[PDB]
Ligand binder design. Structure first.
Ligand SMILES: Cc1cc(=O)oc2cc(O[C@@H]3O[C@H](CO)[C@@H](O[C@@H]4O[C@H](CO)[C@@H](O[C@@H]5O[C@H](CO)[C@@H](O[C@@H]6O[C@H](CO)[C@@H](O)[C@H](O)[C@H]6O)[C@H](O)[C@H]5O)[C@H](O)[C@H]4O)[C@H](O)[C@H]3O)ccc12
Ligand code: NAG
Ligand code: NAG
Ligand code: MAN
Ligand code: MAN
Ligand code: MAN
Ligand code: MAN
Ligand code: MAN
Ligand code: MAN
Ligand code: MAN
Length: 363
């Protein structure tokens, strides 16, 4: 059954998609030998989320769901995993990940069309449970980066567009998780309450959509789930890992009118702790990282629906080239792996790093 009550990760198996599998098999594996090559084939079988970072990625979502329908007709019990990620003036506090739509060029109307396209796909594939992460680095930017003109000027559009996404994708086979930053972003004491207030306000404003299950944390970041020692870059914070973060924010959501909110947490690049970060705010292509806890609904935690791999390891965070378009200074930092291609492009040396440092190990 595609429909569900409670945890949408229970009773299904997340599908490992062909897009990442193709990247690994055709961009990574030909450069690897022996033990590394075998291990890499195994990484491609770990389910990670497919990012709908352009409208012309929607045909690939459809293909993925088509593959799943076939597998499920043949005895499979698989679920699709996708990231909705195409807001106008996207990624407003950074320069690396600017998208195809802008508010000044009819971006809100274009975003609504993009959402409409996704809704039609989800309607077609009502037979497949569909797990969605909604708009990484959008709402979190509204909590801490209204001092960035691009974010301030986007605030109204973000809220309109996110409302449209969560209402229009509010369907019986869907579970949505709003992106909610991470321990080192919104876990800071002064950021917790405003963050919770914003998430609960989005939820209430959308008429409390039943398909809106909760929040996604650590997306495209590196924090440990439940590491027992605070890394040096966490500066003595109470909230120094994702478990502490969700247990801090969870009750605050309930306080602000969002009860029964649950979480998923990206561990795709969290295997090696501490990481190579020299400042907690360093997010771009972080050195000394590894593949982390494998996706599982067996979390041993009251609030965590599932460990997930949202950001696909190997896919770049942003270019390190000062002369290239979409260059962000964060990607040139001592703790950012050099030289890096455009955001989303394959970054072979980074994949190798993740594989070498994987915990649990693939080798
Ligand atoms: C010292 C101190 C004190 C205090 O009180 O508060 C703070 C708060 C701090 O927070 C820091 O805030 C910054 C923002 O100012 C955060 O930076 C943001 O980090 C996120 C990751 O956590 C970055 O996300 C990137 O962009 C997107 C995902 O949204 C990804 O790009 C896409 O990847 C897809 C899959 O491969 C592709 O399909 C797509 O084509 C591609 O574009 C990218 O990989 C991801 O890295 C965001 O850009 C960035 O602004 C920081 O995390 C947080 O710690 C710090 C210190 C405090
Ligand atoms: C509430 O929803 C409306 C559309 O019904 C939208 O324009 C607005 O941005 C939302 N406000 C908040 C605070 O989420
Ligand atoms: C952390 O979580 C993992 C996965 O659930 C578990 O195996 C491990 O025992 C946990 N460690 C601690 C200290 O809670
Ligand atoms: C969705 O609806 C189906 C109806 O077949 C139920 O079996 C399931 O429990 C879920 O609520
Ligand atoms: C998801 O589907 C897989 C295979 O279809 C199972 O191994 C798992 O138990 C879950 O039903
Ligand atoms: C599978 O898909 C990947 C990602 O689009 C390509 O890099 C590869 O060539 C193959 O077509
Ligand atoms: C790409 O294809 C290879 C085989 O060519 C697999 O081993 C890998 O898992 C991925 O699907
Ligand atoms: C990765 O992509 C290539 C095409 O560039 C395929 O031939 C290969 O089998 C894998 O899917
Ligand atoms: C895989 O990586 C090697 C370097 O290890 C390259 O030479 C090759 O082109 C592919 O990117
Ligand atoms: C890694 O190990 C596998 C065994 O599963 C071999 O098939 C391959 O040649 C590689 O060395």
């Amino acid at each position: 059954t595609a429909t569900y009550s409670g945890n949408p990760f229970v009773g299904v198996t997340p599908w490992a998609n062909a897009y990442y599998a193709s990247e690994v098999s055709s961009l990574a594996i030909p450069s690897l030998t022996g033990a590394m090559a075998t291990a890499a084939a195994a990484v491609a079988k770990v389910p990670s989320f497919m990012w709908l970072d352009t409208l012309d990625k929607t045909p690939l979502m459809e293909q993925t769901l088509a593959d799943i329908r076939t597998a499920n007709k043949n005895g499979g019990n698989y679920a699709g995993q996708f990231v909705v990620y195409d807001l106008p003036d996207r990624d407003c506090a950074a320069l690396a990940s600017n998208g195809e739509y802008s508010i000044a060029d009819g971006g809100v109307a274009k975003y609504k069309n993009y959402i409409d396209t996704i809704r039609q796909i989800v309607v077609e594939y009502s037979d497949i449970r569909t797990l969605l992460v909604i708009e990484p680095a959008s709402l979190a930017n509204l909590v801490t980066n209204l001092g960035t003109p691009k974010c301030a000027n986007a605030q109204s559009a973000y809220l309109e567009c996110i409302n449209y996404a969560v209402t229009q994708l509010n369907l019986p086979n869907v579970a949505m998780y709003l992106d909610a930053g991470h321990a080192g972003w919104l876990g800071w004491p002064a950021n917790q309450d405003p963050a919770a207030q914003l998430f609960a306000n989005v939820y209430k404003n959308a008429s409390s959509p039943r398909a809106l299950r909760g929040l996604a944390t650590n997306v495209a970041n590196y924090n440990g789930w439940n590491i027992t020692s605070p890394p040096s870059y966490t500066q003595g914070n109470a909230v120094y890992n994702e478990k502490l973060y969700i247990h801090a924010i969870g009750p605050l959501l309930a306080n602000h009118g969002w009860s029964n909110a649950f979480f998923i947490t990206d561990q795709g690049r969290s295997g090696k702790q501490p990481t190579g970060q020299q400042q907690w705010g360093d997010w771009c292509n972080v050195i000394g990282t590894g593949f982390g806890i494998r996706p599982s609904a067996n979390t041993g935690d009251s609030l965590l629906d599932s460990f997930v791999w949202v950001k696909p390891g190997g896919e770049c965070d942003g270019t390190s080239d000062s002369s290239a378009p979409r260059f962000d200074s964060h990607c040139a930092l001592p703790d950012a792996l050099q030289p890096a291609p455009q955001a989303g492009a394959w970054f072979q040396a980074y994949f190798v790093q993740l594989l070498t440092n994987a915990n649990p190990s693939f080798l």
